[PDB]
Design a protein around this ligand. Structure first.
Ligand SMILES: O=P(O)(O)O[C@@H]1[C@@H](OP(=O)(O)O)[C@H](OP(=O)(O)O)[C@@H](O)[C@@H](OP(=O)(O)O)[C@H]1OP(=O)(O)O
Ligand SMILES: Nc1ncnc2c1ncn2[C@@H]1O[C@H](COP(=O)(O)OP(=O)(O)O)[C@@H](O)[C@H]1O
Ligand SMILES: [Mg+2]
Length: 216
């Protein structure tokens, strides 16, 4: 019957679709996530196509979403919250890592406030599954930098407050494939300017990933 999806973070009920390449995410409190997918579809379709998993449909309170992990033999996933948290400040100042594949092995704790040193170490821990080939992990980082730098650019022209949105970083163990996408629109709001807090989150990650890519 029901196969639970292996979430990295969050609190939402998420299951595999009965069909390949789909995940079903329950909207717990309101349909606001659906309203925001549809708004972005009508007002910023290009943003939706570049950065956001496909919404294929709705079944009562379930969103049918593209499984970002589907085309991977051995996916490693990191969830980084880049939008404002509800009440708390960010564990790494401009963003909060919420989890990653194998994080329990490094005693990662999502409640722990981190220094720059510990933040960088947790991202390094996440890259460990990618093996010893410096050149291949560096190509993963550069492709993430490529898409995040375009996202930061595009966000200047989008009049949404991306409260609670996450970045889902994915790379294959063999480092042949990687991506990053924006998920979780449940608390996103209309506003009459751009979201400088969320832009600062992305530019700060671009800065951290760039030092990792340039490390000797
Ligand atoms: O601090 P946040 O905003 O990163 O964390 C929220 C938390 O989000 P998440 O960890 O499920 O993504 C849950 O909120 P929802 O995203 O589910 O609405 C927690 O329930 C929420 O606590 P609360 O809903 O009981 O206020 C966390 O917020 P808070 O710790 O800032 O209060
Ligand atoms: N489209 C997706 N494809 C693959 N994994 C996803 C997708 N959306 C969410 N996830 C997984 O589910 C987790 C929680 O997703 P999110 O939308 O942030 O839900 P919540 O509202 O519970 O925080 C993420 O950390 C990630 O592991
Ligand atoms: Mg979330």
């Amino acid at each position: 019957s029901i196969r639970i999806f292996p979430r990295i973070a969050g609190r939402s009920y998420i299951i595999y679709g009965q069909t390949s390449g789909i995940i079903c995410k329950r909207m717990e409190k309101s349909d606001n996530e659906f309203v925001i997918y549809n708004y972005i579809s009508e007002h910023y379709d290009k943003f939706l196509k570049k950065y956001v998993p496909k919404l294929y449909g709705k079944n009562n309170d379930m969103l049918l979403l593209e499984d970002l992990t589907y085309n991977y033999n051995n996916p490693n996933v990191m969830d980084v919250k880049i939008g404002a948290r509800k009440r708390k400040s960010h564990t790494s100042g401009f963003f909060s890592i919420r989890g990653y594949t194998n994080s329990h092995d490094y005693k990662f704790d999502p409640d722990e406030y981190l220094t720059s040193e510990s933040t960088i170490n947790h991202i390094k821990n996440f890259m460990e599954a990618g093996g010893e080939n410096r050149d291949k992990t560096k190509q993963v980082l550069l492709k993430w930098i490529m898409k995040l730098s375009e996202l930061a650019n595009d966000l200047f022209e989008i009049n949404l407050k991306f409260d609670g949105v996450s970045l889902i970083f994915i790379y294959d163990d063999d480092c042949s494939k990687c991506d990053v996408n924006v998920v979780d629109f449940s608390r996103v709001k209309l506003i009459d300017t751009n979201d400088q807090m969320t832009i600062s989150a992305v530019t700060n990650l671009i800065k951290i990933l760039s030092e990792l890519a340039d490390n000797p």
